[PDB]
Amino acid sequence: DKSNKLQNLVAEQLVGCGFNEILNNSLTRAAYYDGLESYPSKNLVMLLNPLSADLNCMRQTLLFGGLESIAHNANRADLKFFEFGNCYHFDAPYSEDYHLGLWVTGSNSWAHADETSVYELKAYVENIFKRLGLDLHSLVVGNLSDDIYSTALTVNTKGGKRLATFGVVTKKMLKAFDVDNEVYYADLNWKELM
Amino acid sequence: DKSNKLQNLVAEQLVGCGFNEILNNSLTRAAYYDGLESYPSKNLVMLLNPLSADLNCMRQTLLFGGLESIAHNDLKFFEFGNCYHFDAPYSEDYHLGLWVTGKMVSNSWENTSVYELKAYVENIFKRLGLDLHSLVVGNLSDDIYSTALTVNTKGGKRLATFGVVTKKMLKAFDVDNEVYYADLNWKELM
Amino acid sequence: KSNKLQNLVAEQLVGCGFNEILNNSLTRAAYYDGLESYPSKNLVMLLNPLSADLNCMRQTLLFGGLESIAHNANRKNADLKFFEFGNCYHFDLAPYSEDYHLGLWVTGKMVSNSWAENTSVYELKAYVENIFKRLGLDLHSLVVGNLSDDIYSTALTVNTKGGKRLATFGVVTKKMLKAFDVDNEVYYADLNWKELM
Amino acid sequence: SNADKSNKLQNLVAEQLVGCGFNEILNNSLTRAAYYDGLESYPSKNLVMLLNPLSADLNCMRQTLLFGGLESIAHNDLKFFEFGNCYHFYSEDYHLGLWVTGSNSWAHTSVYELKAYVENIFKRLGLDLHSLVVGNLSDDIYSTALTVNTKGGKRLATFGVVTKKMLKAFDVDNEVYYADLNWKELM
Ligand SMILES: [Mg+2]
């Protein structure tokens, strides 16, 4: 109920900020994870006879679905998408966790150099954090450069639980998914924010 | 888009009728489907190395999760969730399930509870702006329901199924009260 | 104020599963042929009509909504619920006048000759009642009359004690659904918005 | 029998209320349709009307105990209660009504005392307080009120402050706090 009410509130808040809520399938492609360090293939919840099926595993991250939606969007530089959803993980060796993903897509002039950056995403994230009554001074923030992120921040409790990751998707990953304009991605560990 | 708002409107309406929302794992046990006809074992989306763990497949039906929840805890539960089907042989579909507990199972002296359950479903349909007159209602008793109604389009597409869960099924789940179960094919209703 | 209330009523209707529609004010004079409720002689005719289908300004919202229902046919199992705010025009120094209306259209069952309109007027009555409440209108001040004409098989009128029409709503005639290629029943309300202010 | 049980609990509650200073009142089941003219909460359309209603002062069955209690208040800090059948289109439902009438100096009236009496009735009846859903209400009867429902949504009680208008109609001054408990539903 706490989750459900707070999900509703976070959604209303994000829609009020011009976000669109998306829904992607939990069924996904194992190949997306081939070679990955942050979401390794060995931790995929694989399905039976996976050679004979295109969708052959359960998603370990929301990220790839979001990239598919962006790539497929008729209007694809002003996109703000969010998705609440279960992800799946193999080490009970199997686990199901609930995530909130955010996707924000993004001139010449001196006057208008102050506009599209990761910081607009960080603001969205902070505002979610404040709406959940998170103590901002408790947070331990670290740095990440990834197979998914060229740069990004990790956000942990003083106790060590991962609360969030957010940053700038590598251009390579964007090329892989047929997306041209910059993408800022946040993965919020929803259970840990209660 | 329209789905999200309606889910919310339906969740609120159900809470107002004293329902509590539940969330069950999409990972489940193939053994639940053993010898079922309505949700055949052969249509289960099994996991790779199914012997490696207790959880060994994706759910085909929301039903069993709800029975587990009833057997865990007069209950009224609802759940929005994906189910998974093996026929790209692997698909996912979105369902709304309702569980309503009734009287203790006894040998003492089902019609009237199906019609209480039907009232909740009607009110869901109205909230979805559905044309009640366009529906075709059928009778059903199977391995899931001793007594149930099916709701089809005039073309014969299934939109909902609801009724009384078999005593055998109740027994399989250590459930001691009668259970009234609805499964709404939510995507089909959009 | 009118603007504030229009927004409030729109939000309420959208909340109830309505979609707002917008239809052209330029329309077809032949729709009004032989009508008594909106007579052909009271139409505001164009000096330079574009065609037989575009030769006058609308006298009623009704017809545009029936066109919209016709164009919104679906294979889904859902009622269409539409509303529209718009001006209508009347010919009677200044013979041409305009007034502002809110129309509501709600579709029902497929037209059939099967056994079993009373319950339809009662369902539409609720949306109208809640609009009135939203406008702070005092229900017990209103006088409700019965009506049957070329538009409605069965209808209610809502009037002030003085006899001023505030709303009309009911079941659209079968003949009219047919003439518009609409194959579901239609419950239609016309609220005279300015009079509600 | 069920009626034997209702009778016993009715007596326990009546003794408890009397002990607390209430007087039991009894009013006619026959009433005036005029009372219900224009009401939303108890619609005129739902009265069990008697034949030739224009030719009888008392021309219908009561839907609510409220009006008889207001008549009783006029005719006498009062505390009144009444058990009695109500009628509407078909239902006969037994109800319990409670009426309580009501400084400004810092050292030293409201609905809170009425709530306490209601809560004490719920407890006498073994009703689990923690399963109850409370809502707000404002209408032609109450300027402010709480509604009390079961989890599933069945109305068990309504209690609050009667509108000054309603009280004006029955020649009643000051404040009246009124509770209507759906006795049948509490059995
Ligand atoms: Mg006392």
UniProtKB/Swiss-Prot annotation, chain C:
Identify the coding gene: pheT
Its ancestry begins with:
Bacteria, Pseudomonadati, Bacteroidota, Bacteroidia, Bacteroidales
What's the family? Belongs to the phenylalanyl-tRNA synthetase beta subunit family. Type 1 subfamily.
Name of the protein = Phenylalanine--tRNA ligase beta subunit
Q: How does it assemble?
A: Tetramer of two alpha and two beta subunits.
Task: Give the UniProt subcellular location, in the record's own words.
Answer: Cytoplasm
Curated annotation (Swiss-Prot), chain D:
Protein name (Swiss-Prot/TrEMBL): Phenylalanine--tRNA ligase beta subunit
State start and end of the fragment within the whole protein: 504 to 713 of 820
**Family the entry assigns:** Belongs to the phenylalanyl-tRNA synthetase beta subunit family. Type 1 subfamily.
GO CC annotations?
A: phenylalanine-tRNA ligase complex
Q: Which organism is it from?
A: Bacteroides fragilis (strain YCH46)
**Which subcellular locations apply to this protein?**
Cytoplasm
Protein origin, superkingdom:
Bacteria
Its predominant location is cytoplasm
Q: How does it assemble?
A: Tetramer of two alpha and two beta subunits.
Q: What is one process in the GO biological process aspect for this record?
A: phenylalanyl-tRNA aminoacylation
User: Any idea which UniProt keywords this protein has?
Assistant: Aminoacyl-tRNA synthetase, ATP-binding, Cytoplasm, Ligase, Magnesium, Metal-binding, Nucleotide-binding, Protein biosynthesis, RNA-binding, tRNA-binding
Gene (UniProt):
pheT
Q: Name one GO molecular function term.
A: phenylalanine-tRNA ligase activity
